[PDB]
Design a binder for this molecule. Structure first.
Ligand SMILES: C[C@H](C[C@@H](C[C@H](C[C@@H](C[C@@H](CCN1CCCC1=O)N1CCCC1=O)N1CCCC1=O)N1CCCC1=O)N1CCCC1=O)N1CCCC1=O
Ligand SMILES: C[C@H](C[C@@H](C[C@H](C[C@@H](C[C@@H](CCN1CCCC1=O)N1CCCC1=O)N1CCCC1=O)N1CCCC1=O)N1CCCC1=O)N1CCCC1=O
Ligand SMILES: C[C@H](C[C@@H](C[C@H](C[C@@H](C[C@@H](CCN1CCCC1=O)N1CCCC1=O)N1CCCC1=O)N1CCCC1=O)N1CCCC1=O)N1CCCC1=O
Ligand SMILES: C[C@H](C[C@@H](C[C@H](C[C@@H](C[C@@H](CCN1CCCC1=O)N1CCCC1=O)N1CCCC1=O)N1CCCC1=O)N1CCCC1=O)N1CCCC1=O
Ligand SMILES: C[C@H](C[C@@H](C[C@H](C[C@@H](C[C@@H](CCN1CCCC1=O)N1CCCC1=O)N1CCCC1=O)N1CCCC1=O)N1CCCC1=O)N1CCCC1=O
Ligand SMILES: C[C@H](C[C@@H](C[C@H](C[C@@H](C[C@@H](CCN1CCCC1=O)N1CCCC1=O)N1CCCC1=O)N1CCCC1=O)N1CCCC1=O)N1CCCC1=O
Ligand SMILES: C[C@H](C[C@@H](C[C@H](C[C@@H](C[C@@H](CCN1CCCC1=O)N1CCCC1=O)N1CCCC1=O)N1CCCC1=O)N1CCCC1=O)N1CCCC1=O
Ligand SMILES: C[C@H](C[C@@H](C[C@H](C[C@@H](C[C@@H](CCN1CCCC1=O)N1CCCC1=O)N1CCCC1=O)N1CCCC1=O)N1CCCC1=O)N1CCCC1=O
Ligand SMILES: COc1cc(CCNC(=O)c2[nH]c(-c3c(F)cccc3F)nc(=O)c2O)ccn1
Ligand SMILES: COc1cc(CCNC(=O)c2[nH]c(-c3c(F)cccc3F)nc(=O)c2O)ccn1
Ligand SMILES: COc1cc(CCNC(=O)c2[nH]c(-c3c(F)cccc3F)nc(=O)c2O)ccn1
Ligand SMILES: COc1cc(CCNC(=O)c2[nH]c(-c3c(F)cccc3F)nc(=O)c2O)ccn1
Ligand SMILES: COc1cc(CCNC(=O)c2[nH]c(-c3c(F)cccc3F)nc(=O)c2O)ccn1
Ligand SMILES: COc1cc(CCNC(=O)c2[nH]c(-c3c(F)cccc3F)nc(=O)c2O)ccn1
Ligand SMILES: COc1cc(CCNC(=O)c2[nH]c(-c3c(F)cccc3F)nc(=O)c2O)ccn1
Ligand SMILES: [Mn+2]
Ligand SMILES: [Mn+2]
Ligand SMILES: [Mn+2]
Ligand SMILES: [Mn+2]
Ligand SMILES: [Mn+2]
Ligand SMILES: [Mn+2]
Ligand SMILES: [Mn+2]
Ligand SMILES: [Mn+2]
Ligand SMILES: [Mn+2]
Ligand SMILES: [Mn+2]
Ligand SMILES: [Mn+2]
Ligand SMILES: [Mn+2]
Ligand SMILES: [Mn+2]
Lengths: 181, 181, 181, 181, 181, 181, 181, 181
């Protein structure tokens, strides 16, 4: 079992359902949450951020693509395209905005938001897909400076991100986590 | 039991309460969900669409007529008429709009929305009853181009409709379903 | 047990919690729901109408006085007066409007709303207390034509009132109920 | 166990979860709710007021600092500061307003709101932290006359405060409670 | 809706799940619980008796055949036969005794248990199927005087049966019910 | 509200459902739990003892008569008599023993069990009804020295009775309670 | 998604938690429940049989090894060995009998129980591990003719096994399933 | 917060309610679960063992003293003494056996059960109090070789104890824990 203590923190810090979705996502890609425990903390973080993001705005505003199984996520991605007319993205996005009619790619990075946004923008060729990056320091960067949600909703996500960083720094796990991305 | 596999898909694809309401509705009209399984999938679909439709808008906006028993649905249809003054419709409608003061007939078709709207409009003589048609392809057609709900609420219904079509096409049940209406 | 069948209808027509509150209210005033079964149906009706009324509007808009015990209802009536400055009403009202700063007396009558409003207005001397009457036929009458809630919220109450009347007429209990007020 | 009857009233008057949070807060500071029962009633009162306060406004508007453990409350206080840029307060505040970008110190006093606000303002050196005082008589005083929430939300808190006072006066516990602050 | 008051008593006297199973059983056989209300009370009674019967004895002692759908009940009846070797009964029984290896036919009659047992024994040709009759007066008659369960379990069923009779006699519905079998 | 502190202890010491049943029982007999608070503690105590008593023994062993409404309790008392043949008791008993075929009168006294048993035996003329007395000191006395349940079940009731006495002595309410029977 | 209809039957026939445990077990071994759907039905069947098996007997009789994750199942297998002294089995067993002090290997086969027992006995070298085989036809074979549980508990498992076979035969999936082991 | 990783393991290994009871027990004695984390794991372990111990045997067999607050635990200890006649123990015990009429002191040690039993027996002067020691290795020692419960119930406790030891050894926390008692 290796007994990694980053693993015990992830199970105590995150929601049991978020932990289970992160485990299924990693195992589907041939990754062990017990071995690649720094990632394990990252999919949980990215998953939670995606969920609070969809919690912002109206009730029927967002369609959640992240967290589903690969086949089901691509099925919903299709149905959105064949009903609105948006182009099918090359890579699986995180959300869909029914209010702005675009897919959203949510990013959570340990470095400056400038580089990660560049890597995210260079990966996707469909420039229509909206990009929204968050950082553990409290920064954010969105496409065309369009941050989609309200300031209070984005502030809650930043607060949670910094709380996670503090809890890992208290357990001396932050240095390894930052130097793993 | 015939062992129809359209039946197993309906039970796995739809909500248990929606399946139970569709079964009671079919049996009340002398129809077997185990035999007329293409219909069985259609009442479930029509039922779900009616429910998400009422989920759009405000909390007290819609009165749900579809899904009730025949006697109870006609009792509520009455009470709405004897309190607002709207004319009693000849056939049982699906919803009532407290905001626009009209009954809504929700349609879900496998062909072009043009024909089905014509059949729905020719059936009812009370032209006051509002008609709103949806299609599995992603089209919609409403009376006087008044689509009642927001675009995001209607888009969610279209996305779900196309997801159902994909799941049946994956199980090779879509061709029989489309050629049954 | 007398075996009155109006009693069985009240238990089947109304919510179990509403039935229990009506029973405690009647017993507190020395009345048997098993004997005075026409009243029993009326306190349940009045109770439900009061509850849907408070369900209209915003979340913190209304304070519910009806349904509480006599001592507790007068305690809350006080606290509202000693904090807002409104005069203490002589008789226990049903609600309090934090938005309009007034107590509301809800009426549900079997005759024309004109007479019942007159009896309700002649009873209270505090003309500041707002009066809102409903009828089983679908009429309503409020003080200064100020109906407080939205039209859709009031329409839902009227629809429910007429549904109750129909269910009793089907059981031949409506004639006795109307001739009891 | 001393058998103080102020203790039994607190357990009957307040929510079980609010009582448990008040007990943990007192024990953390080396105080016995069974001995210092007048305080015990006050932390419960202050806790409830803080909770209804956060219930006002939008869903993601307030971050709740009061009620958490000391280390966790300071962790969230940090994360809010390192993400918004607000100065770290010297003493632990009660809430944080994501809408106005400020910490809120909620006060509940048994005397005139004028003195308590002065003591609260003299304690904190960070004049940016917003102060909102409530009284058991129905008064309130906020920094710069900015009362943050709606009138109806604040009125509900005042009504509850006066209800608590009445319930203690009925049990002859109000005189000791007022002369303990 | 006919407004039969036997119907309202059945809905108030019996469990909501038992009422729903009785309604599905009657509708499956082309019977209206709103019209044939004396039967409606009888399937509910027979259903409840069958359920308390299986509640007697050990946990895994009885397999419940009554209450299931016709196809599913015959499927379980088969599986019991193809695993134990018991002969397939001609008519659907109520229970199966894993302890005594026999099917049980439960009877609830309004006349003397002697006649009903004779009619039940003449109907089935498989003399291996055990017969257990109950009466509303407090009598019981079982095959070979083998009453299967304990005396206390059977006494509880008799007590409930007489309670149902009293509740109907109080509502003047007992005379019609007894003269309907 | 009188603000009696025996009342607050009863609400904190006993189960919410037991408190509600005791309140309905007292109000049915024209007694105020807020005024006759020493009784209020006694019906709760007697009610709880009756419930733990039925919790002893097998699952279907006891029929609970105490706690029901007067008409319903007499209905069940009848059905037990018309099915087993036991004589109808003159006064309402507490339980019925399906194992020993007798009604049980449970007593909870503040004096010696000798006197209370004599008063209980002189009240009832049906000597068949079993009598079982408990005391707050830890004594018990049953008819024909037949204590019905196991020693461990009766010991749990005695322990609970002495715990209640201690909690009242700590609040200085025991002296008034003992001198009220 | 392949749209296999054996998959839809497994999801409708088995418990949602049993389906989830079977999916995790297959994915852990690099198997797709959507592709190897005949297996998918078998792990669900084997899982359910293991669960009903542990449901037989006393409450603390069995320790469940099957269904856990590989590392956790081996951890519990150890703790049982290091506390009772039983030899560590070479392969992961299904249960442990605290009453007989032995591990149990549960088998569910589509052929005669004779061959499968031979394959199961030849696989394990620890002859101390008890073997209990079940068949879809209604047969069973246990080590030393020691069938561990009662006849009624084993009969329930056989009945369920034959019910599963019938449901697949009705959907024409039984022939492929039997010819896959 | 110190960020001790023994703390994270305790929160992941033990039940949330057991963790909360251990935290209240430590804080009551002036101990920090965040600092004295080796103890923190021990009170959780001792608490769980006490709970499974009471889960063995009949339903009303054991009275649970451990886990309660100090005043309440001594209140129940009294009531047991003043009703059965057993002598009041000098130190708070863990359980009470209604079947054997004695208090039980449960021990969980990291060394040989011989020494710990001696320390436990030398501490208490009331030789009537029964002593039952468990070890993380799988040993147990009880007074007069009377192990109270069944072998299967005690074996489950031993298995759980060894599982806890393995989980800590995997996280390299076992060496510090054993060298802390
Ligand atoms: C729908 C359901 C799960 C949703 C995920 C998401 C979780 C949501 C839960 C809410 C309640 N809150 C808020 C407070 C705590 C809590 O619990 N939040 C948001 C914050 C963290 C969290 O947990 N939502 C949104 C709709 C309801 C729901 O639960 N998902 C998973 C991926 C796709 C999807 O829509 N589904 C769908 C099928 C499988 C499944 O599980
Ligand atoms: C009221 C009740 C049933 C309602 C039908 C409808 C179902 C609603 C459930 C909601 C919650 N969501 C949303 C997320 C999943 C879920 O579950 N949605 C909407 C989406 C699909 C669905 O299921 N609604 C609306 C009010 C509450 C409720 O449940 N119906 C049935 C016909 C009449 C009616 O009003 N009733 C009334 C008596 C019998 C009964 O069952
Ligand atoms: C607060 C609680 C009871 C409330 C009465 C009222 C009932 C409300 C329930 C809601 C949910 N809906 C809506 C759908 C069905 C349902 O159930 N509605 C409204 C419609 C009918 C109904 O039932 N509300 C409002 C707040 C939450 C709640 O339940 N009351 C009783 C008198 C005072 C009061 O505030 N209280 C308070 C202490 C005792 C008690 O019971
Ligand atoms: C989040 C949770 C507790 C929250 C405290 C607060 C309590 C809230 C409960 C709501 C529901 N209502 C309203 C009706 C009755 C009720 O119950 N209200 C408000 C009124 C009184 C009350 O009780 N809220 C707000 C979010 C959901 C929730 O419960 N707290 C405690 C301190 C930090 C915090 O956010 N947490 C967080 C982890 C530990 C815990 O317990
Ligand atoms: C299994 C389930 C329903 C069972 C019927 C039966 C009902 C049982 C409920 C128990 C709990 N008690 C007792 C106190 C009140 C209550 O509620 N009792 C017995 C007394 C009246 C009653 O209601 N049982 C037994 C197992 C669990 C359960 O519920 N049935 C229905 C027919 C087949 C069957 O096994 N099933 C199975 C699939 C559909 C469904 O609904
Ligand atoms: C049946 C139901 C109430 C029962 C009373 C009785 C209460 C029982 C509850 C159990 C669970 N435990 C035990 C742990 C805590 C708890 O809660 N115990 C026993 C100890 C104290 C207590 O509370 N029982 C027994 C059957 C299930 C049930 O609840 N009563 C009330 C009078 C008649 C009757 O049978 N009924 C029936 C209709 C109205 C109602 O409420
Ligand atoms: C403990 C828990 C799951 C258990 C598996 C097992 C399931 C049990 C559920 C019971 C209730 N019934 C019976 C009626 C329907 C139902 O639901 N049955 C038995 C029949 C089918 C079924 O489902 N049991 C037994 C203890 C309680 C429980 O649930 N398992 C899974 C593997 C290890 C284990 O002990 N655990 C443990 C941690 C993860 C998890 O999930
Ligand atoms: C009564 C209640 C708590 C009890 C403690 C104990 C916990 C019990 C829970 C059971 C269910 N299981 C078993 C499976 C998982 C689970 O959860 N087990 C046993 C194993 C671990 C566990 O958790 N029991 C026994 C009665 C019901 C109950 O819960 N306690 C705490 C100290 C005194 C006491 O009696 N009380 C009483 C008032 C405060 C409180 O909390
Ligand atoms: C090693 O590869 C994987 C991928 C997944 C899901 C991929 N699908 C996404 O959509 C995805 N992944 C990531 C991401 C991460 F969460 C951790 C590390 C690196 C990443 F790129 N960030 C996103 O923002 C995102 O949208 C799960 C497990 N392992
Ligand atoms: C075979 O007849 C039936 C009818 C009902 C309910 C009828 N009442 C409606 O209200 C209704 N029916 C249908 C509909 C359908 F769902 C499937 C096929 C054909 C249809 F017309 N579409 C609607 O939109 C609608 O409102 C149930 C079972 N069988
Ligand atoms: C016989 O007297 C009573 C009174 C109460 C509550 C009185 N308090 C009110 O507040 C109240 N009562 C009534 C009302 C009614 F519900 C039925 C008949 C006559 C009425 F006036 N209508 C209201 O609108 C109202 O507000 C309960 C039982 N019996
Ligand atoms: C004796 O000291 C303590 C302090 C705490 C929490 C302190 N932290 C706060 O934040 C806090 N305390 C108080 C407060 C009170 F609730 C009662 C008496 C005096 C007070 F100042 N009023 C607030 O408004 C507030 O924000 C808990 C127990 N004992
Ligand atoms: C009109 O025919 C039906 C039959 C059923 C179920 C038949 N299957 C049984 O198994 C069954 N029926 C009856 C029974 C009854 F419940 C009421 C009247 C007459 C009866 F014979 N008594 C039993 O004991 C029994 O086992 C449902 C509706 N209508
Ligand atoms: C003032 O009269 C009442 C009577 C009832 C219920 C009567 N029915 C019983 O069955 C009953 N009553 C009492 C009892 C008591 F609980 C308190 C004081 C005196 C008593 F005799 N002890 C029993 O043991 C018992 O069985 C409720 C309220 N007030
Ligand atoms: C540092 O002192 C404490 C004591 C308590 C509860 C004492 N009451 C008992 O009853 C108790 N304590 C312990 C025990 C332990 F769990 C850990 C270390 C040493 C111990 F002796 N083992 C038992 O078996 C037992 O019955 C809580 C916190 N700190
Ligand atoms: Mn993604
Ligand atoms: Mn992303
Ligand atoms: Mn319709
Ligand atoms: Mn329609
Ligand atoms: Mn009123
Ligand atoms: Mn009114
Ligand atoms: Mn504070
Ligand atoms: Mn404050
Ligand atoms: Mn039958
Ligand atoms: Mn009694
Ligand atoms: Mn196996
Ligand atoms: Mn202890
Ligand atoms: Mn101990």
């Amino acid at each position: 079992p290796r007994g990694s203590h980053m693993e015990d923190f992830v199970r105590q810090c995150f929601n049991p359902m978020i932990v289970e979705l992160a485990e299924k996502a990693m195992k589907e890609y041939g990754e062990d949450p017990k071995i690649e425990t720094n990632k394990f903390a990252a999919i949980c973080t990215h998953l939670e951020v995606c969920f609070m993001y969809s919690d912002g705005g109206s009730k029927h505003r967002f369609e959640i693509i992240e967290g589903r199984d690969r086949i089901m996520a691509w099925t919903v991605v299709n149905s959105i395209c064949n009903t609105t007319g948006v182009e099918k993205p090359k890579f699986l996005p995180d959300l869909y905005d029914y209010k702005e009619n675009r897919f959203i790619e949510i990013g959570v990075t340990r470095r400056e938001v400038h580089i990660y946004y560049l890597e995210k923008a260079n990966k996707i060729k469909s420039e229509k897909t909206h990009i929204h990056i968050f950082s553990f320091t409290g920064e954010e960067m969105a496409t065309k400076a369009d941050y989609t949600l309200d300031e209070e909703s984005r502030a809650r996500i930043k607060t949670r991100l910094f709380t996670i960083r503090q809890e890992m720094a208290s357990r001396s796990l932050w240095d390894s986590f930052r130097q793993s991305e």
